[PDB]
Ligand binder design. Structure first.
Ligand code: 3T1
Ligand code: 3T1
Ligand code: CL
Lengths: 99, 99
């Protein structure tokens, strides 16, 4: 697909039997999704924004789907003001910036 | 051009006669640049991220050039961990996400 930037680039992301709305974020290395229950083990991680650090749970090797495109990667689960898909998953769906 | 997302999408921008490096950031509505000297009148603004808000100066009708594409728009000046080109300007130069 081609996604315009005339409004925020919002998509539904599927992880297993869970659906979440998320913002395609080329400004972020990592994917951060709030309030979801993935199974199995996680690693603790501090991630930074302008005013400090949020603690998140790092989930590796997760199967995700975005607009019919499957990808594998790390999801960070923790409180975020918006759910964001960073470049770790943007590259895995073959997403580029074009102008 | 086409910009893959394997690396941070940092581009050179021309603004107020000077060349600066900036992050192309589809996760942000607005363009935020490190303190620079811009001529003329400005409007006070507060912009939020993780943990709080940063005081910025809002300047309208700023000529900014990115990879040949000359745009005119609103730039917010103040402290930021990285210069960010937001959707206001990205959509102005016909930037899209494609996969
Ligand atoms: C490219 O360099 C940077 C990029 C970024 C990324 N882009 C931003 C660019 C300019 C200002 C602020 C953000 N903010 C966030 C970003 C992230 O990658 C993580 C994100 C986040 C999400 C949820 C919970 C906590 C944190 C906060 C941040 C910093 Cl501090 C950088 O130095
Ligand atoms: C779509 O909703 C939001 C988008 C964003 C934007 N993208 C992020 C997405 C997830 C987590 C954090 C950031 N952070 C920043 C963002 C901005 O648009 C401004 C940016 C900034 C830059 C310099 C100085 C101050 C602030 C901080 C933030 C919040 Cl709080 C949102 O609710
Ligand atoms: Cl932030």
């Amino acid at each position: 697909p081609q996604i315009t930037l005339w409004q925020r680039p919002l998509v539904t992301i599927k992880i297993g039997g869970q659906l979440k709305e998320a913002l395609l974020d080329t400004g972020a290395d990592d994917t951060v999704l709030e309030e979801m229950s993935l199974p199995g083990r996680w690693k603790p991680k501090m991630i930074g924004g302008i005013g400090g650090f949020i603690k998140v749970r790092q989930y590796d090797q997760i199967l995700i789907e975005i607009c019919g495109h499957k990808a594998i990667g790390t999801v960070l689960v923790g409180p975020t003001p918006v759910n964001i898909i960073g470049r770790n998953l943007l590259t895995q769906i073959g997403c580029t910036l074009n102008f």
